[PDB]
């Protein structure tokens, strides 16, 4: 394994690492035959986030699977990704050598333990419904909500419109009924009342990474109980997020 | 049944009514004073002198303000036997004054302080069209 990242890709790599840290507690590193894969899974295994990086830096695997505590990586790339080059290899130790301005070089040796291969099963083709929209609109749509919320419900109203609500399970709390218009979204294959209920934190990490170059999301929601899929496509970057729905 | 208990607090006859200084400097001084101790003494004079005093077993600090215009008092027949150099200072706990100074963000034009001898300090502010009445109990 040998990767040499040069340019502004360091910032987007750090943002992806931050989103994964916001989702999961451990980081799975897997060199595939077509690039690098970063994987993370929630503690209760109710959410799964994967970033596949198309060959863009130097990718060359084999001369092959690891997992690391994620707080260490998060701290390293929060304090050391503001930096003109990055180098990643596998000695034996994981070297995260980081070239900097002038002649300063910083090296980071880390400890890893053997783990199994993590994967999931998603069927985007099997999903009837489909929704597409720019990420900025959705990010603006989730701003009025308080930062202490747990569950959010997405639905399609009567009249071809979207609706985001606040699911609550006599000292109650506030409720929100934010609504949008069909003229902002670009593609809707929906129905006359199909709605789903999911979490918020992983969605917030997804939106945080998706609010950089004005990317477009894609939601494939199905009947309640079945998982939802959030897919982000870019030039040289693929990402897929799988959540769970209340049944 | 509780409608009477939320009525506007009554304002007794103030022993001394004094114009207040700029709020930012007073807030900064009080904030720096919070570290040393949790007790403060406020003193109001008849010539527009406002004194903030703390006295510990190790350090004693006193801050003076002068040239504060005394508003024309309604009772003009009760000043022939009251010493101008006399004062009606009081002592309060510095935990509720700091909140009141920190909340404000703009300096109004109706900054008034009414001080009584026994157990009461009262603040009057008015900005644009909104009036604020502040009541801080004494006896820290």
């Amino acid at each position: 394994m040998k990767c040499l990242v040069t340019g502004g890709n360091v910032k987007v790599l750090g943002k992806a690492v931050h989103s994964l840290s916001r989702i999961g507690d451990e980081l799975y590193l897997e060199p595939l035959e077509d690039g690098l894969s970063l994987r993370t899974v929630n503690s209760s295994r109710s959410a799964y986030a994967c970033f596949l990086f198309a060959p863009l830096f130097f990718q060359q695997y084999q001369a092959l699977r690891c997992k690391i505590l994620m707080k260490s990586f998060l701290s390293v790339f929060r304090s050391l990704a503001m930096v003109e080059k990055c180098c990643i290899s596998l000695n034996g130790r994981l070297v995260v050598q980081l070239h900097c301005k002038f002649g300063v070089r910083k090296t980071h040796n880390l400890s890893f333990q053997d783990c199994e291969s993590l994967q999931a099963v998603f069927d985007p083709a099997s999903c009837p419904h489909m929704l597409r929209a720019p990420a900025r609109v959705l990010g603006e749509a989730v701003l009025p909500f308080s930062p202490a919320l747990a569950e959010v419900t997405l639905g399609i109203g009567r009249g071809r419109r979207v609706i985001l609500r606040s699911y609550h399970e006599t000292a109650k709390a506030m409720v929100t009924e934010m609504c949008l218009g069909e003229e902002d979204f670009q593609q809707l294959q929906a129905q006359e009342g199909v709605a789903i209920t999911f979490c918020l934190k992983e969605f917030r990490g997804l939106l945080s990474f998706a609010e950089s170059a004005n990317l477009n999301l894609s939601i494939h929601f199905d009947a309640p109980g079945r998982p939802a899929i959030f897919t982000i496509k870019d030039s040289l970057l693929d990402g897929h997020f799988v959540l769970a729905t209340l049944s | 049944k509780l409608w009477k208990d939320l009525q506007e607090p009554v304002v007794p006859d103030p022993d001394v009514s004094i114009y207040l200084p700029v709020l930012k400097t007073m807030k900064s001084v009080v904030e720096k004073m919070k570290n040393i101790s949790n007790h403060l003494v406020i003193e109001a004079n008849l010539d527009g002198e406002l004194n903030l005093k703390i006295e510990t077993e190790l350090v004693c600090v006193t801050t003076h303000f002068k040239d504060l215009g005394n508003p024309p008092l309604a009772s003009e027949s009760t000043h022939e036997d009251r010493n101008v150099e006399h004062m009606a200072e009081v002592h309060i706990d510095i935990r509720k004054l700091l909140q009141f100074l920190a909340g404000q963000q703009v300096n109004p034009t109706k900054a008034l302080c009414n001080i009584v001898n026994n157990k009461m300090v009262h603040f009057d502010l008015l900005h644009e069209d909104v009036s604020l009445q502040y009541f801080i109990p004494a006896l820290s």
Partner: protein, 439 residues
């Protein structure tokens, strides 16, 4: 040759467990009656599992869950490199109770029923003990899948278990109970014999098999705990070891003190009372009071109170009672200050125990215990409630006639007051003190 014998001979099938069949059957019928009668409207529930360490509570549950195809959810404490610990715990609980796993890559797929197992409780739960009650109430309100709690307890020093579940949340939350017992000698004997036979059949070299005479010695000094027994067997088979400390189960220590197991005065050279102390001759004793009191892990001032509560019923004469009472009073005197209360405390307990033991001359004549000692339970001191009532009544007398002496001088006047006055909650207090039963 890379794992210990504890981790190498684990029970795969149910029949390889070292637990009595009835307990396994009870856990199994509870779990299977929950699974079979799983109503769609069934709410949450909490199961409590207790027992001394090293009996096999976790392994039997895991085996029974795997046999019937049940998903289990563990709870491992997160590792620090702002959010509170309780916040993380509640978030995990909500996620586990609400949603399910996705697909994984190779699992026991056909699952829609699961239980949550929590063993590694956080420290804040031990320090506070009041967040747990709110968490349990919320779970009972919003629970779907049952919650199983596993606790490890010893005979003396059980503060954590009673602090966590103080008989009130169990009563008002409808929590069940299942208690294990130490493994019987025969079961451990048969399993140890099987293990040593398996090692012997390995051959490889001429190694001395451990002697049989030490094999029951190994099981005798372990008190029904498999893991230390296997560890000691591994240590001893290299060519007694495993002296786990005992806790003595305080209610057993009280009986040991109060029953005075005596001997028939075997011929020895013990000193005798020469001429005039002929009424103080006693038979040989086979108990050390100091070790008994120390091993119960209790403060001395509490042991003396329990002895004072429970020592009367075992006596038959009055003079011995007088002597015992005098000894107890003298033991009390030595601890009445505050600066030197902890410098000298062993004297009081030792004096009280030895006085109560020696003063019983009726019982202390060897072959004179036939017959009696019926099925009698002990009790608890009554001084605590009376003292607390005295203190609260002190305050209720002071602050409300404040213009101890008031209870000693003014309260006699109150007792001879008996006239009404202008209040509502005070007439009840007046009628409280002054209406003691009297014919």
């Amino acid at each position: 040759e890379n794992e210990p014998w504890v981790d190498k001979y684990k029970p795969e099938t149910q029949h390889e467990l070292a637990v009595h069949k009835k307990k396994i059957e009870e856990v199994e019928t509870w779990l299977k009656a929950q699974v079979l009668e799983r109503q769609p409207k069934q709410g949450g529930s909490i199961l409590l599992i207790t027992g001394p360490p090293g009996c096999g509570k976790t392994t039997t549950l895991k085996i029974l869950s795997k046999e019937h195809g049940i998903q289990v959810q563990e709870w491992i404490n997160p590792v620090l490199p702002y959010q509170s610990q309780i916040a993380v715990f509640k978030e995990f609980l909500l996620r586990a109770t609400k949603y399910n796993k996705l697909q994984m890559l190779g699992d026991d797929l056909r699952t829609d029923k699961k239980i949550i197992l929590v063993e590694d409780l956080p420290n804040q739960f031990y320090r506070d003990s009041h967040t747990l009650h709110e968490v349990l109430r919320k779970y009972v309100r919003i629970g779907r899948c049952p919650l199983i709690f596993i606790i490890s307890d010893s005979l003396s020093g059980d503060n954590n278990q009673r602090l966590l579940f103080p008989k009130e949340i169990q009563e008002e939350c409808s929590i069940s109970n299942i208690s294990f017992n130490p493994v019987a000698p025969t079961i451990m004997m048969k399993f140890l014999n099987r293990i040593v036979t398996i090692e012997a059949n390995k051959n490889g070299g001429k190694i001395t098999v451990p002697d049989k005479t030490s094999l029951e010695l190994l099981c005798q000094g372990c008190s029904g705990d498999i893991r230390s027994a296997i560890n000691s067997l591994q240590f001893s088979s290299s060519k007694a070891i495993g002296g786990k400390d005992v806790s003595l189960f305080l209610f057993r220590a009280l009986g040991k003190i109060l029953y005075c197991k005596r001997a028939s005065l075997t011929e020895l050279d013990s000193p005798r009372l020469p001429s005039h102390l002929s009424e103080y001759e006693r038979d040989t004793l086979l108990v050390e009071p100091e070790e008994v009191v120390e091993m119960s892990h209790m403060p001395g001032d509490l042991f003396n109170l329990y002895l004072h509560q429970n020592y009367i019923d075992f006596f038959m004469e009055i003079d011995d009672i007088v002597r015992a009472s005098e000894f107890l009073s003298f033991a009390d005197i030595l601890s009445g200050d505050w600066n030197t209360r902890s410098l000298l405390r062993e004297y009081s307990t030792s004096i009280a125990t030895r006085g109560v033991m020696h003063s019983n001359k009726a019982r202390g004549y060897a072959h004179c215990q036939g017959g009696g000692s019926s099925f009698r339970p002990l009790h608890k001191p009554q001084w605590f409630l009376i003292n607390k009532k005295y203190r609260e009544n002190c305050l209720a007398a002071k602050a409300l006639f404040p213009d101890l002496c008031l209870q000693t001088q003014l309260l006699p006047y109150l007792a001879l007051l008996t006239i009404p006055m202008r209040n509502q909650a005070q007439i009840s207090f007046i009628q409280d003190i002054g209406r003691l039963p009297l014919k």
